[PDB]
């Protein structure tokens, strides 16, 4: 019985360029391809006959070119497939069904990231669902122009559901985040989502009481710097100076 060395793999049509399906078996006397329940012509087959290194048995290597027009013309229930069959003195053998699909990628995203307002300690999740296409598109994130790398920082990482997760604000500051769907046919960039990191201003501890001056009054100082109000963040609610009656 013949044993396959090289089996036909699942190939995709990029643009309109032909695909090659390599098939090799040992021992082989005759080798033919069967596409969608129909045999391929002998002239279309590119045969390669050679003697095996391990034992004195004939080895055959065959390759067929399948164009874009050949795939799209076949209309039915199941997808375009090509199975390689090998012959010998003992019997026949069947290889794995290699599925040939026309590669594509849509323009409209299923889900795009939106603008979010977050504080210094709180964490945010930026969701993204890439457009439909065969094979599925890989997801890459951009912080403004620069590519987001999850290996550089543990606080910034991309989940299995393509969403970007950030747990802090100083480790990932203010930036327009855009989701990029990457496929062999086309690269699709989503709309930029403005992520703003605000610092809510809270008062600093009270200073020491000043000496009792004239008109029986003494003041105390206060500052809005623990933490200081940055970006959109709200200012400190209260007074900068506190007056109290204390003398002669
Ligand atoms: C996003 O870019 C716009 C200009 O196109 C800018 O005005 C805005 O502040 C940016 N947002 C962030 C978070 O950088």
Curated annotation (Swiss-Prot):
Residues 2-99 form the Ig-like domain. Residues 200-248 form the TSP type-1 domain. Glycans are attached at residues 65, 176, 203, 206, 209, 245. Residues 113-192 form the Ig-like C2-type domain. Disulfide bonds join 23-84, 35-82, 128-179, 212-246, 216-247, 224-236. It is found in: Cell membrane; Membrane raft; Cell projection, Neuron projection. Induction: By p53/TP53. It comes from the Eukaryota. Phosphorylated on cytoplasmic tyrosine residues. Phosphorylated by PKC in vitro. Residues 1-248 are extracellular. Receptor for netrin required for axon guidance. Functions in the netrin signaling pathway and promotes neurite outgrowth in response to NTN1. Mediates axon repulsion of neuronal growth cones in the developing nervous system in response to netrin. Axon repulsion in growth cones may be mediated by its association with DCC that may trigger signaling for repulsion. It also acts as a dependence receptor required for apoptosis induction when not associated with netrin ligand. Down-regulated in multiple cancers including colorectal, breast, ovary, uterus, stomach, lung, or kidney cancers. The ZU5 domain mediates the interaction with MAGED1, which participates in the induction of apoptosis. Belongs to the unc-5 family. Homodimer and homooligomer. Interacts with the cytoplasmic part of DCC. Interacts with MAGED1. Interacts with PRKCABP, possibly mediating some interaction with PKC. Interacts (via extracellular domain) with FLRT2 (via extracellular domain). Interacts (via extracellular domain) with FLRT3 (via extracellular domain). This is Netrin receptor UNC5A. It comes from Homo sapiens (Human). The lineage of its organism: Eukaryota, Metazoa, Chordata, Craniata, Vertebrata. The gene is UNC5A. The chain holds residues 43 to 294 of 842 of the full protein.
